[PDB]
């Protein structure tokens, strides 16, 4: 009916999460990690990624 949705806060863990945490502690930046909405990784759909 509408494409509006709630941004439910969830918990990430795993391998690349630990990589991102150690990158954040070494390079000393901040970040707002979030999840994708479209689905999978990506594809150049007729010169559109």
């Amino acid at each position: 009916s509408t494409n509006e949705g709630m941004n439910v806060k969830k918990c990430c863990k795993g391998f690349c999460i630990d990589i991102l945490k150690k990158l954040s502690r070494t390079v000393k930046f901040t970040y707002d990690l979030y999840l994708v909405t479209n689905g999978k990784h990506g594809k150049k759909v007729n010169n559109v990624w």
Binding site: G14, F15, D18, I19
Partner: protein
């Protein structure tokens, strides 16, 4: 390597071999063929 160890961790009948015993059955068939060779002569 520590994170690979942390998150990527995994492990590693009386009719055992009919193949070699069936090869000995082929030897048995060769034996009965040689018995037929000695039989016809």
């Amino acid at each position: 390597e520590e994170l690979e160890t942390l998150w990527l961790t995994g492990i590693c009948s009386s009719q055992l071999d009919i193949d070699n015993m069936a090869g000995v059955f082929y030897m048995l068939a060769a034996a009965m063929a040689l018995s037929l060779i000695t039989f016809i002569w």
